[PDB]
Design a protein around this motif. Structure first.
Motif, PDB file in Angstrom:
ATOM      1  N   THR A   1       0.813  -1.210   0.000  1.00  0.00           N
ATOM      2  CA  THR A   1       0.000   0.000   0.000  1.00  0.00           C
ATOM      3  C   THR A   1       0.852   1.267   0.000  1.00  0.00           C
ATOM      4  N   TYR A   2       0.222   2.383  -0.367  1.00  0.00           N
ATOM      5  CA  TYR A   2       0.897   3.675  -0.432  1.00  0.00           C
ATOM      6  C   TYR A   2       0.509   4.570   0.738  1.00  0.00           C
ATOM      7  N   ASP A   3       1.443   5.397   1.202  1.00  0.00           N
ATOM      8  CA  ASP A   3       1.121   6.421   2.189  1.00  0.00           C
ATOM      9  C   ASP A   3       0.352   7.578   1.548  1.00  0.00           C
ATOM     10  N   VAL A   4       0.757   7.939   0.333  1.00  0.00           N
ATOM     11  CA  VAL A   4       0.176   9.085  -0.357  1.00  0.00           C
ATOM     12  C   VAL A   4       0.100   8.870  -1.851  1.00  0.00           C
TER      13      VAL A   4
ATOM     14  N   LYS B   1      11.706  14.000  -2.375  1.00  0.00           N
ATOM     15  CA  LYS B   1      11.835  14.356  -0.971  1.00  0.00           C
ATOM     16  C   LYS B   1      10.986  13.423  -0.103  1.00  0.00           C
ATOM     17  N   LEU B   2       9.792  13.092  -0.590  1.00  0.00           N
ATOM     18  CA  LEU B   2       8.905  12.170   0.119  1.00  0.00           C
ATOM     19  C   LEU B   2       9.538  10.804   0.323  1.00  0.00           C
ATOM     20  N   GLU B   3      10.111  10.280  -0.750  1.00  0.00           N
ATOM     21  CA  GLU B   3      10.711   8.956  -0.745  1.00  0.00           C
ATOM     22  C   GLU B   3      11.945   8.953   0.145  1.00  0.00           C
ATOM     23  N   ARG B   4      12.695  10.051   0.126  1.00  0.00           N
ATOM     24  CA  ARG B   4      13.850  10.172   1.001  1.00  0.00           C
ATOM     25  C   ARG B   4      13.378  10.096   2.444  1.00  0.00           C
ATOM     26  N   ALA B   5      12.171  10.603   2.682  1.00  0.00           N
ATOM     27  CA  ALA B   5      11.618  10.647   4.024  1.00  0.00           C
ATOM     28  C   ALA B   5      10.986   9.300   4.390  1.00  0.00           C
ATOM     29  N   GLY B   6      11.102   8.315   3.499  1.00  0.00           N
ATOM     30  CA  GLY B   6      10.527   7.001   3.737  1.00  0.00           C
ATOM     31  C   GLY B   6       9.028   6.942   3.505  1.00  0.00           C
ATOM     32  N   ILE B   7       8.485   7.946   2.823  1.00  0.00           N
ATOM     33  CA  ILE B   7       7.053   7.989   2.545  1.00  0.00           C
ATOM     34  C   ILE B   7       6.773   7.321   1.198  1.00  0.00           C
ATOM     35  N   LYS B   8       5.851   6.363   1.205  1.00  0.00           N
ATOM     36  CA  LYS B   8       5.561   5.567   0.017  1.00  0.00           C
ATOM     37  C   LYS B   8       4.571   6.302  -0.850  1.00  0.00           C
ATOM     38  N   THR B   9       4.996   6.579  -2.074  1.00  0.00           N
ATOM     39  CA  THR B   9       4.281   7.492  -2.937  1.00  0.00           C
ATOM     40  C   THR B   9       3.785   6.838  -4.208  1.00  0.00           C
ATOM     41  N   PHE B  10       2.515   7.094  -4.503  1.00  0.00           N
ATOM     42  CA  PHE B  10       1.930   6.730  -5.780  1.00  0.00           C
ATOM     43  C   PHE B  10       2.049   7.857  -6.790  1.00  0.00           C
ATOM     44  N   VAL B  11       2.660   7.542  -7.924  1.00  0.00           N
ATOM     45  CA  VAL B  11       2.823   8.496  -9.007  1.00  0.00           C
ATOM     46  C   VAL B  11       2.437   7.750 -10.276  1.00  0.00           C
ATOM     47  N   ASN B  12       1.492   8.321 -11.018  1.00  0.00           N
ATOM     48  CA  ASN B  12       0.857   7.622 -12.127  1.00  0.00           C
ATOM     49  C   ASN B  12       1.812   6.997 -13.155  1.00  0.00           C
ATOM     50  N   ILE B  13       2.846   7.728 -13.572  1.00  0.00           N
ATOM     51  CA  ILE B  13       3.716   7.288 -14.660  1.00  0.00           C
ATOM     52  C   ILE B  13       4.562   6.078 -14.295  1.00  0.00           C
TER      53      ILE B  13
ATOM     54  N   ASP C   1      -7.994   3.203  -7.526  1.00  0.00           N
ATOM     55  CA  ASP C   1      -7.008   2.328  -6.897  1.00  0.00           C
ATOM     56  C   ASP C   1      -6.048   3.130  -6.033  1.00  0.00           C
ATOM     57  N   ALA C   2      -5.513   4.195  -6.624  1.00  0.00           N
ATOM     58  CA  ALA C   2      -4.514   5.037  -5.972  1.00  0.00           C
ATOM     59  C   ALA C   2      -5.077   5.691  -4.725  1.00  0.00           C
ATOM     60  N   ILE C   3      -6.278   6.241  -4.833  1.00  0.00           N
ATOM     61  CA  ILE C   3      -6.894   6.964  -3.725  1.00  0.00           C
ATOM     62  C   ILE C   3      -7.238   5.980  -2.616  1.00  0.00           C
ATOM     63  N   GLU C   4      -7.886   4.884  -2.988  1.00  0.00           N
ATOM     64  CA  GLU C   4      -8.419   3.950  -2.010  1.00  0.00           C
ATOM     65  C   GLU C   4      -7.294   3.150  -1.350  1.00  0.00           C
ATOM     66  N   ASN C   5      -6.147   3.055  -2.023  1.00  0.00           N
ATOM     67  CA  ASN C   5      -4.981   2.369  -1.469  1.00  0.00           C
ATOM     68  C   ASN C   5      -4.020   3.407  -0.900  1.00  0.00           C
ATOM     69  N   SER C   6      -4.511   4.632  -0.714  1.00  0.00           N
ATOM     70  CA  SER C   6      -3.715   5.686  -0.095  1.00  0.00           C
ATOM     71  C   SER C   6      -4.400   6.410   1.052  1.00  0.00           C
ATOM     72  N   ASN C   7      -3.585   6.697   2.059  1.00  0.00           N
ATOM     73  CA  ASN C   7      -4.004   7.361   3.279  1.00  0.00           C
ATOM     74  C   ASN C   7      -4.334   8.817   2.977  1.00  0.00           C
ATOM     75  N   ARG C   8      -3.562   9.461   2.101  1.00  0.00           N
ATOM     76  CA  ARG C   8      -3.861  10.849   1.779  1.00  0.00           C
ATOM     77  C   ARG C   8      -3.601  11.104   0.313  1.00  0.00           C
ATOM     78  N   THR C   9      -4.235  12.145  -0.222  1.00  0.00           N
ATOM     79  CA  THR C   9      -4.012  12.532  -1.608  1.00  0.00           C
ATOM     80  C   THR C   9      -3.376  13.923  -1.635  1.00  0.00           C
ATOM     81  N   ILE C  10      -2.179  14.052  -2.187  1.00  0.00           N
ATOM     82  CA  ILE C  10      -1.585  15.362  -2.467  1.00  0.00           C
ATOM     83  C   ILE C  10      -2.105  15.973  -3.769  1.00  0.00           C
ATOM     84  N   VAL C  11      -2.582  17.216  -3.738  1.00  0.00           N
ATOM     85  CA  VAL C  11      -2.979  17.885  -4.980  1.00  0.00           C
ATOM     86  C   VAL C  11      -2.078  19.084  -5.289  1.00  0.00           C
ATOM     87  N   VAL C  12      -1.455  19.041  -6.462  1.00  0.00           N
ATOM     88  CA  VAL C  12      -0.433  20.007  -6.841  1.00  0.00           C
ATOM     89  C   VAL C  12      -1.075  21.107  -7.668  1.00  0.00           C
TER      90      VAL C  12
END
Length: 125
Positions: free
Chosen positions: A1-4, A23-35, A50-61
């Motif tokens: 699963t992903y953290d974000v 920076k997130l990954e360096r911080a040990g945060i598991k990140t979903f990125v589409n590509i 899938d991404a949202i439901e398997n993630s604790n939070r969603t970052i919007v840029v």
């Protein structure tokens, strides 16, 4: 699963991957990125959900291109039923519905020293 999960316009992909995800990954945060993490041959809506439901939070840029991007908009609406972390990456007209949500202002240099701290703190609680 992903953290974000990260919701972003393709025009901003340089910064998203090389700075934010980095920076997130360096911080040990598991990140979903589409590509990287999207499943090929699945429908767009399937990979999004899938991404949202398997993630604790969603970052919007947030940026001007974000708000002209159809796929980005649809993702946000669903994200509002969970937890989102809005980042102001580039100045833009923020729509009414994010216009009353506290965001992280990356353009604000004076608030840069706490940007990452706050982001990471929020994800980990």
């Amino acid at each position: 699963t992903y953290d974000v999960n990260i919701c972003y316009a393709p025009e901003d992909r340089e910064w998203v991957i090389n700075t934010l995800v980095f920076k997130l990954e360096r911080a040990g945060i598991k990140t979903f990125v589409n590509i990287r993490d999207d499943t090929p041959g699945n429908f767009f809506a399937e990979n999004i959900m899938d991404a949202i439901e398997n993630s604790n939070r969603t970052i919007v840029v947030m940026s001007p291109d974000f708000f002209k991007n159809n796929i980005c908009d649809k993702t946000l609406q669903i994200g509002l039923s969970h937890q989102i972390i809005p980042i102001l990456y580039r100045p833009c007209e923020v729509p009414y519905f994010l216009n009353h949500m506290t965001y992280l202002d990356w353009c604000d240099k004076d608030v840069r020293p706490v940007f990452w701290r706050n982001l990471f703190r929020d994800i980990r609680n």
